Every structure is written in C-alpha cells, then in structure tokens.
Write a structure and sequence with these properties.
mainly alpha, 2 helices, Antimicrobial_frog_1, hemolysis, fungicide
C-alpha cells in the first residue's frame, strides 16, 4: 500500500535498502 513513499524510501532510506537486499 501507499506506493508513492516507497519510491521516496528507495532514495532517502539506503540504510533500509542495503539491509533488506543484503548486498551493500
């Protein structure tokens, strides 16, 4: 749900993005 802020989170949340993908 809330699909807008997922695009924002993918730029302003690299902290989450590295941890979920685990390849940073």
């Amino acid at each position: 749900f809330l699909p807008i802020l997922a695009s924002l989170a993918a730029k302003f949340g690299p902290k989450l993005f590295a941890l979920v993908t685990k390849k940073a």
